[PDB]
A paper describes a structure:
ICPD 26, 34 and 47 essentially bind to Hsp90 in the same way. A crucial network of hydrogen bonding between the resorcinol group and highly conserved amino-acid residues, Leu 48, Ser 52, Asp 93, Gly 97 and Thr 184, of the ATP-binding site is present as previously seen with pyrazole and isoxazole resorcinol inhibitors. Hydrophobic interactions that are also conserved include those with Asn 51, Ala 55, Met 98 and Phe 138. Although the ICPD compounds bind Hsp90 in similar ways, the Kd values for the binding of ICPD 26 and ICPD 47 (7.5 and 4.8 nM, respectively) and ICPD 34 (Kd = 39.0 nM) are very different, with ICPD 34 being less potent. ICPD 26 is similar to ICPD 34, except that it lacks a 3-methoxy group.
The molecular chaperone Hsp90 is responsible for the maturation and activation of specific client proteins that are key components of signal-transduction pathways that regulate growth and proliferation. The present series of the 5-aryl-4-(5-substituted-2-4-dihydroxyphenyl)-1,2,3-thiadiazoles (ICPD 26, 34 and 47) were recently synthesized and shown to be effective Hsp90 inhibitors in terms of binding to Hsp90.
Residue numbers in the entry:
A (entry chain A), B (entry chain A): 16 to 224
The structure:
């Protein structure tokens, strides 16, 4: 009961561009993922203003960054609105076919990879640093699902068997071998202070034994 | 059947700050409003990917800028998802109480008024240039409503009697007397090219007789 899907051709092309393009300022992936968490936190915050029971699955709106040097993973957890199975399958809630088109044109009209979030498809910048990304998500009244892709044209979706998350999304980045700087506390703190210093939810960087 | 509402105190404070603070780079209002139109266009585009009938109220996703020097108005029209009456009353679909708090703190931690969109409340930058803003909006399956406010602590909502809009939002800025530069074609073109050159929907600047 793992379902395997092909990416639409425009999204496979976006992913190949991100993986194959020489581009040294990889650290923008974290700004993009923290931005998406902030947008998801804004959404549950706005829904709660009229229906407080929407927070029954967790009242605290925040972001956790969890490095694990043994697993070579950096995990970003938020307690935002979460995604339904349909939204995961439909490009993680993004307008990715049209966004990808505009981004390609921009890149011709001069833009650079760091502008990717202006085209609605910043999630895929994860592949600047990760060989595999796993997305575990829970929206109120839908079940918990895990999406995962090592690129190559396909992704899987299954019902998740992990720990329950309450509500929100967890992005687990399985880092490339040469990208382990992004597990180091000083490097993560530096990038958060540089690019996410005004995000309006607490961001807690976990430490390791 | 005009309903009059008080702004929550944090939003009245945000509006007073924007109106009373000396700050010369007013032109950022247009970037903020065009951004909100783009976000609303992204939303109907994403809903249409799974339900095409959502576009029965208009298939074209675009933004029009309409200056009128006789009325001293600059109007921004989009054919995005639109807002329900509830969303208009609840601060135009924004998390404005919490966004306002963060923005105030940022402004202390050094930030400037141009960063307002990072706090979810960029709409209110309209009051850098407008004495009165009128917001006319139509979401699928809700009626067309007009919101309006000259600040001073209150806004009104009524069912709109204007021309039907199909779907989307129209922001009519009734400009301050000293802010008429923003009706001039070269000035609007300059600001769109400077700050909204990569927005992914057509932006048509209307001309005047
Ligand atoms: C910008 O488009 C977006 C589309 C969808 C989302 C949503 S809705 N629920 N979770 C996420 C989310 C998705 C991702 Cl990929 C993530 O990294 C963190 C998240 O909380 C956010 C932004
Ligand atoms: C950033 O938060 C936002 C909150 C709500 C919206 C939405 S949903 N439908 N219309 C608008 C909209 C609202 C405004 Cl004010 C506008 O200028 C243009 C619009 O299309 C957009 C952004
Ligand atoms: Mg945004």
């Amino acid at each position: 009961e793992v379902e395997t899907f092909a990416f639409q051709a425009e999204i496979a092309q976006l992913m190949s561009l991100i993986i194959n393009t020489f581009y040294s300022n990889k650290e923008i992936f974290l700004r993009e993922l923290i931005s998406n968490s902030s947008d998801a936190l804004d959404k549950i915050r706005y829904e709660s203003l009229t229906d407080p029971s929407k927070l029954d699955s967790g009242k605290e709106l925040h972001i956790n960054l969890i490095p694990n040097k043994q697993d070579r993973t950096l995990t970003i957890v938020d307690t935002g609105i979460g995604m339904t199975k349909a939204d995961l399958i439909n490009n993680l809630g993004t307008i990715a076919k049209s966004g990808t088109k505009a981004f390609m044109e921009a890149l011709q009209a001069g833009a650079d990879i760091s502008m990717i979030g202006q085209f609605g498809v910043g999630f895929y910048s994860a592949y600047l640093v990760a060989e595999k990304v796993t997305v575990i998500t829970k929206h109120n009244d839908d079940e918990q699902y895990a999406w995962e892709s090592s690129a190559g044209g396909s992704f899987t979706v299954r019902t998740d068997t992990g720990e329950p998350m309450g509500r929100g999304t967890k992005v687990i980045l399985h880092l490339k071998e040469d990208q382990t700087e992004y597990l180091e506390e000083r490097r993560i703190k530096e990038i958060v202070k540089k690019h996410s210093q005004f995000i309006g939810y607490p961001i807690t960087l976990f430490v390791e034994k």
